[PDB]
From a paper:
In solution, however, the recombinant TgGSK3 expressed in insect cells predominantly exists as a monomer, indicating that homo-oligomerization process does not occur spontaneously, but is instead dependent on external factors such as substrate binding, co-factors, interacting partners, or post-translational modifications. In this regard, during crystallization trials of TgGSK3 with LY2090314, an intriguing observation was made: alongside the standard crystal forms, a monoclinic crystal lattice emerged after several weeks, diffracting at lower resolution (3.0 Å) and containing four TgGSK3 subunits within the asymmetric unit. These four subunits can be reduced to two homodimers, interacting through non-crystallographic symmetry. In each dimer, TgGSK3 forms a face-to-face interaction, relying partly on the seed region identified in the yeast 2-hybrid screening, which spans most of the N-lobe. Despite these structural rearrangements, the activation loop remains in a DFG “in” conformation due to the interaction with LY2090314. While these findings may not directly translate to TgGSK3, given the distinct functional role of the two kinases, they highlight a broader role for this cysteine in regulating dimerization and activation through redox signaling. Together, the Y2H results and the monoclinic crystal structure suggest that the activation pathway of TgGSK3 in T. gondii relies on a homodimerization process, likely controlled by the conserved cysteine 213, a feature preserved across species. Converging evidence from yeast two-hybrid assays and crystallographic analyses revealed covalent dimerization of TgGSK3, mediated by a conserved cysteine residue within the activation loop.
TgGSK3 was identified as a fitness-conferring gene for tachyzoites, as its genetic disruption results in a fitness score of −4.1223. TgGSK3 adopts the characteristic kinase fold, divided into two sub-domains classified as the N- and C-Lobe. Overall, TgGSK3 has high sequence (54% identity) and structural conservation (r.m.s.d. of 1.67 Å) to the human ortholog, with most of the structural variation located within loops in the N-lobe (N-terminal region).
Author numbering:
A (entry chain B): 27 to 64, 66 to 186, 193 to 365
B (entry chain A): 27 to 91, 96 to 188, 192 to 365
C (entry chain D): 27 to 62, 66 to 183, 193 to 365
D (entry chain F): 27 to 61, 66 to 97, 102 to 185, 192 to 365
């Protein structure tokens, strides 16, 4: 049913390629992975998701190979998905090359839809576990953002690489963690969208723990125990917490032009990037932040002038995972 | 001119699959990786250079069959060896049996010699682990492979997700290192061969440094900085150095007639696993160690009874990169 | 003693698995069969030959009680491990749309004959020779017999079974293994089974369509209960007809095609008594290439063991065969 | 959940072993196969008085290395028709007619059920027909060869003639032919067409059914038309059992009804072989429908008549009034 043509980089190690569905002429994305045919976690998770900001699962099928053999005729699972041409990663580097900041309306739209998508996932009990700009699909014309790449997602049963966006509890080898690790990533994406470069760029985990400490300050004994208990008494150098207003001072200087956006973005950044995972602002709660107040005004449009994408038709599971204060605030 | 059938696994990015050469009837391994024909492939150029009894032979290579494409598929054809040190180890583990000292000697020797040659060309493998060490049970030949991470370390430049066998300088944001990182791996493999489990098994960059310190002791201020200068004044908790006979006490206990095997292996383990990369015993130099004296006796055989594999017909390049003291000891 | 791992497949009446010998690190095959004395193990203890699997060890494993139930007892036969079969090598070339090179057809057929000649010299009949039983190492191109669950001093296969067996014969000779040798030479040259019928009737017809009608007397040397039994009358075809297309595609100014087919005709004969004996076959011109000193594997390597005949092998070779076979 | 113990033998593939369910103490049979299965998928569909119940299934791993066992758990019954047969054979005695009727009936009803789901068993033989000596219940088992036949195993004596001619395509009638061979052996004390090979067997079939016509031959395998086969005359079933009919006599139509039922089963043309659910209404089973009939033990007869809706749907109207007592 599909013409496979041209490789779109690499997903969860498996290969992702462009494809045309011959019945409709439409282009789709096909991630082919090597499964053992006697159960694939990513595809079972994909079958559950339905949300305005998650890639649609379209079809799936196994490659034939034909060559039988009393060893392993391998077999390849083909997951067919909605094709969206860009990522938040690309839009950023496009603005970077232009030495220009992403407009605050796009930063608001992207962070919102990322938060809403990750809240749904967490409401189903699913943790994406590898949120980074390279996974946040974007449509330049409608500025829809969709989640994708669920090769690392998992239903965290009580009892991954890409290092710039991992939660600090992960870099300390926490043997147990919560869905909050995605919230730390949300903070890192929002952070990079505002800064023009990663907030905590470091080659290894040691290198990053330092850079996080050089900003959040030295973690307390109690904070350290909420991340990894085995390190409750592991002492770090005593660094005093630096504050966002300072790090972005130059950006606030050059850009800022009659906007409280910078105050709201940095406040929202603070509520995401917290050592104690339980103290991190939950994603569906975050939708109510004043940073998104612009998106609920009726006269707000895309910079193009076109209409805003889907933002407000919350499902009941979305509403159920919102505090009463949040439920009143989000109604546009 | 190959019948491609059955996937062996995932190498550096690409997939490796078994294949039959239709001209000779022989079985080979084909690693298919996603190249860009407009650029150069590092792994293939490196392999094109290697000729050594303990490196996989490069047999052939070819590209497999629009604008906006660019992404083509490089097919590298190599010698097929059906096992790894990884598989042999987990084999003995299940039997609650220690790998015999004759094999621990054979494998570590051939690994050192393969890595000594590699260094003599200026190449660094950068990801030595049991899974890369091909083994043939019948001859107990060991060969290096998986050169997707190899590189001719050029002073002045700058990310691997292999966890247990990386050198401490790598787990700090080093950005400059030497071929000594391969020697640290040699130590971890020899360590695991003797212990039945990884010497420093911890899931993250941070957890492992901790596990290494609980054994090697806290690094001195100068030992740090020969690893990563950016962390010279970084103090760790004060751990006392453990004794290898302590870690191996139970293994040393069970195996009666300790002989110098345990003493020579632990002396050789000590000379590999050193914080300062510059103080680590060089791989060809290691060949002359007393641990391998059994390999040089004329009456020594494999446990099967068969003859020992290639061990001593050193090339001229090997000799030039051996201290004169080592050469008289190594040539039997 | 042994670490048991991968299941390689199914032998005669049991499962065969990979295993590591803990003393040596070597990989071996263990055939575990239900000992509910074995014949196969007695047969295995006798065999020593370059082209038979080595018997390495054996031990019993029991599950349950005894006088209570019937518990279980299992014979575990430990053998030399070879990683491929002729069956696998064949299907590999088939997928490639390629003929097995004549040097490998020579090597495999030669070594198969020698093992079966030795086996027969002991008076043993293998009784189930097929590509799945002919172990091969691509690296050396050594061929070894295995799977002796049917061997016997005088089956569920059908494609490589002799015509006498498929006629229900009660008595047979060791020449049933020579028919199987030819059906393997045939598949190596045709790229597909010479006689491939699902059943034990469909198969005789496909044989008849090539060998012609067995004479009144020929049918009597196969199964006497069928002498005066008439079959449809087909005229015998010629192997050069059946292989005409292959002989064209593979061309060459070599006598291999003529020599290979001359050997096929001498193997595949209705009369068991007229079939070329396995050790006599070694002297056939087909294997003259193997006796040249300059010959190598296609790889470039040395040829496997081919000529160091034991004294028993020599006793079962005609004097003409002895001068032709010693290089 | 299970203690795996004594090995009972080999089914279509894999080994079957005795086992105890630790929860109930009950004994069950576990078929362990090396694996979406077909046999397990088919087993999951069947629920009928004369098919083994599938109780459970579970997989064991054993290994964890780069480059599985299905365990099918079933109702345990300690005998087969095969084992009951050798019992009377060794006893120099014929299987009682009430038992022949019971076994053939339950077998027909089980295969009739199986066909109504579109499944073909393809390897019915005495060794597959479980029996309980106490109740004389018969249940089908060993579905490793079953398949639904959307248009290669070594079963010998009970294969249909179209199968022994390797017919690339066939119908569920092959199970009907086996029913006939099982009934036949129950009456004769030995296989009807026992031969070392297929050749020996067609020869034995030809010596009884006579030489097949071209069109009969074309309903089996279109190939081999007008090809081979001497002129052999059809023999008579009453001749074959003449010695048995003497010794027994009985003054009963049992021998006539059995041989009539044998004739309607063992026919070259597959479409002309008596369908199984039809077979239940045959006069042979009239005794099983009498209220005063009991087992030879004195006990009650097993389940025989409480037909599901599908069983009724595949019975001719004449058959339904004949079968309901
Ligand atoms: O349309 C889609 N539906 C999906 O599910 C899906 C998908 C599936 N797995 C992953 C993993 C990461 C990112 C996206 N995906 C795509 C899909 C859409 N592009 C992709 C690209 C590579 C790729 F591999 C998959 C996709 C290239 N590209 C991109 O911007 N990149 C790739 C990595 C570096 C920069 C960020 C532009 C569009
Ligand atoms: O025969 C060969 N010639 C080569 O060049 C080569 C090769 C190329 N890249 C790599 C990376 C790692 C190891 C080997 N290779 C192989 C090659 C040989 N086996 C391989 C296996 C997987 C694979 F993907 C490649 C190969 C499985 N296996 C094995 O023990 N494993 C795989 C990883 C976990 C356990 C260790 C058995 C032999
Ligand atoms: O190493 C060995 N030493 C022995 O004695 C021996 C052995 C014992 N019984 C039999 C029966 C048939 C073939 C070989 N054997 C083996 C042995 C070696 N492989 C085996 C395979 C299955 C198996 F079941 C046994 C073995 C798989 N395979 C293979 O190519 N196949 C299996 C059947 C279909 C295709 C042909 C690759 C290697
Ligand atoms: O209790 C059960 N529930 C099932 O499903 C089932 C079963 C599963 N597969 C097959 C295949 C053939 C026959 C029965 N089965 C049994 C089961 C019950 N016996 C079995 C015997 C062997 C065996 F392997 C399985 C079973 C021995 N025996 C028997 O009379 N034999 C065995 C073959 C030669 C003579 C006939 C008496 C009881």
């Amino acid at each position: 049913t599909y013409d496979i043509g041209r490789v779109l980089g690499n997903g969860s190690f498996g290969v992702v390629t462009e494809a045309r569905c011959v019945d409709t002429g439409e282009v789709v994305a096909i991630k082919k992975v090597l499964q053992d045919p006697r159960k694939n976690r990513e595809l079972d998770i994909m079958k559950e998701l339905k949300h305005p900001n998650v890639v649609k699962l379209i079809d799936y099928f196994y490659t034939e190979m034909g060559e039988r053999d009393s060893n392993d005729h391998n077999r390849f699972l083909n997951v067919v998905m909605e094709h969206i041409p860009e990522t938040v990663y690309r839009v950023m580097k496009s603005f970077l090359r232009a030495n220009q900041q992403v407009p605050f309306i796009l930063i608001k739209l992207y962070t919102y839809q990322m938060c809403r998508a990750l809240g749904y996932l967490h409401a189903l009990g699913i943790c994406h576990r590898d949120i980074k700009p390279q996974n946040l699909l974007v449509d330049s014309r409608t500025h829809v953002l969709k989640l994708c790449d669920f090769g690392s997602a998992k239903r965290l049963v009580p009892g991954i690489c890409s290092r710039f966006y991992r939660a600090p509890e992960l870099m300390l080898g926490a043997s147990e963690y919560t869905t909050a690790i995605d919230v730390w990533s949300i903070g890192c994406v929002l952070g990079e969208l505002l800064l023009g470069r990663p907030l905590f760029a470091g080659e290894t985990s040691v290198d990053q723990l330092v850079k996080i400490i050089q900003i959040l300050g030295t973690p307390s004994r109690r904070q350290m125990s909420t991340m990894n208990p085995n390190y409750t008494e592991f002492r770090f150098p005593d660094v005093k917490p630096r504050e966002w207003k300072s790090i972005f001072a130059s950006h606030i200087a050059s850009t800022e032009t009659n906007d409280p956006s910078w105050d709201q973005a940095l406040d929202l950044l603070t509520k995401f990037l917290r050592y104690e995972p339980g103290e991190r602002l939950l994603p569906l709660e975050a939708l109510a932040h004043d940073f998104f107040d612009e998106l609920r005004l009726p006269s707000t449009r895309l910079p193009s002038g076109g209409p805003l994408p889907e933002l407000f038709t919350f499902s009941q599971l979305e509403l159920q995972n919102m505090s009463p204060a949040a439920q009143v605030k989000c109604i546009p």
